[PDB]
Design a binder for this molecule. Sequence first.
Ligand SMILES: CC[C@@H](C)n1ncn(-c2ccc(N3CCN(c4ccc(OC[C@H]5CO[C@](Cn6cncn6)(c6ccc(Cl)cc6Cl)O5)cc4)CC3)cc2)c1=O
Ligand code: HEM
Length: 528
Amino acid sequence: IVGEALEYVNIGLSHFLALPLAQRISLIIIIPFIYNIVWQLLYSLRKDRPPLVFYWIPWVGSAVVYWMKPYEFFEECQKKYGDIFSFVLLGRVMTVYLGPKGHEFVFNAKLADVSAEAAYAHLTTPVFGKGVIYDCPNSRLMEQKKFVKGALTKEAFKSYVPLIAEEVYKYFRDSKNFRLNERTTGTIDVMVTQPEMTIFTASRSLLGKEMRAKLDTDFAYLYSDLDKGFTPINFVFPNLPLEHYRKRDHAQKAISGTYMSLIKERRKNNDIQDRDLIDSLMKNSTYKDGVKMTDQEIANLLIGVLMGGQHTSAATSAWILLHLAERPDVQQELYEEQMRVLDGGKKELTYDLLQEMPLLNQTIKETLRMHHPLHSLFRKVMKDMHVPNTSYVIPAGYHVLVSPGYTHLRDEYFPNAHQFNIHRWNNDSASSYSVGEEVDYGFGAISKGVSSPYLPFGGGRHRCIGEHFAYCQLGVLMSIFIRTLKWHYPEGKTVPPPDFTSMVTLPTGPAKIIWEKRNPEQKIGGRH
Ligand SMILES: CC[C@@H](C)n1ncn(-c2ccc(N3CCN(c4ccc(OC[C@H]5CO[C@](Cn6cncn6)(c6ccc(Cl)cc6Cl)O5)cc4)CC3)cc2)c1=O
Ligand code: HEM
């Protein structure tokens, strides 16, 4: 008889339900804990799964170390397991593929195999609004990218350069961080100045003078609120009934409302020209199946483009200033190139003259090598994927993670990779360039291979379309900083370590530098 054992099964179950509440809470904790450990052990036997990083707390996984020190985590895993490994992250399984083959695996993955919008829509849809970027099918995103790129032409950059320059000068004139007409030296926190200079310059050029004027008002606080809603927390908790989440949603409505008002106002007056991204999207935002973007979708798209451009660029110019603050030799070299190309400062800066400043562009290029603003990009796996030349299968429901910024910092691809050296890019100062064959996913021909160890703008269908804008903006900005100021660290201070916990990787604050006018007597005109 085994029937009597099946009775004690039922009996055991009943005694289980009658345990003292202290013992039940205890078990409510210890049972998932034990089961988690046993599951990992069994998992480690499968030869069709990449090794999985061991973790103690269920669901949470390796969340804490990935959040604080993602590259140190990757290096340690790479040492133990090689280039492919998985780890658990707040309920998700992330399969990391390091190095250029990882780039190809993920960036050039078939559209059916992986989804960016499934990975990202929570990080962005609550902030930007509905119907755009990741809150739409991939083919809509492809065309949105085509639309936005339409305002990012050489001719647009030629007209943006003096607008960006004017904002930089105005910021030197009026901001309390500078006041160059009143002060000849001062101390700044670059994580205060660079986000402000970035939003002022990006607004003026992409959004136009009206939207720029708005930032001189209490309206600016809405950008602050919307900005605070752009946080890694959204990855897990995109909506919680806290005040944080409420100021964000309000801001999105208020800011999209303001863009819609401008859009409808311009159409009303037949005042649609070729000034900015707004004019461009009004004139050119009809999908190929004949559907037009709504005014709300246009406004939402504007928010997304400005927000993304805001954080990558601000972080980058902050890093440029910080690396140059201990490199007066590089400031000196950059200054000589400015003197040569602009004829001792007699020539006004133009987009065409920016292209003749290779060391300036190499400085941007080198900063983006050492400080990729996005340490990890990922996709949700939609169909089981076989890893070439292995036995691994990444099942649907997993996420794949790629990290070009990690490869940027490997000695094998960049000798002395932790040394800042703009000259590693001599005669190679282009922001990026296709090393051969090209393809077009709907927003223009881009490189077909994504095997370059240097990939600051990613690749494949989700590739950045902002790189020439970012270089234009960063170039104007740094050209003027260099011609106007010298700067250095307070005694004993040096380049800060990256903070990886925000949406882009920023310098750990407070990152202060001391500036000095190259020409103490130089005045900036205009009224204030
Ligand atoms: C346990 C709780 C707590 C301790 N914890 N523990 C771990 N974590 C955690 C770890 C990591 C992360 N991640 C989430 C993902 N993230 C990130 C990934 C991709 C990314 O952007 C890629 C896409 C989407 O956004 C943009 C960014 N961009 C690109 N160019 C310019 N910006 C983007 C593309 C297009 C447009 Cl229009 C806008 C935007 Cl924003 O590209 C941004 C951040 C890094 C941090 C979040 C939380 C926690 O919160
Ligand atoms: C230094 C500056 C920047 C860097 C390093 C950068 C980096 C990137 C990267 C790595 C991606 C690919 C993301 C992925 O594959 O998951 C991307 C995508 C994108 N970026 Fe940028 N970016 C920068 C600036 C900008 C700017 C200024 C804009 C807008 C003006 C912009 C708009 C976009 C857009 C529209 C995409 C496409 C998103 C998609 O197709 O899924 N970026 N960027």
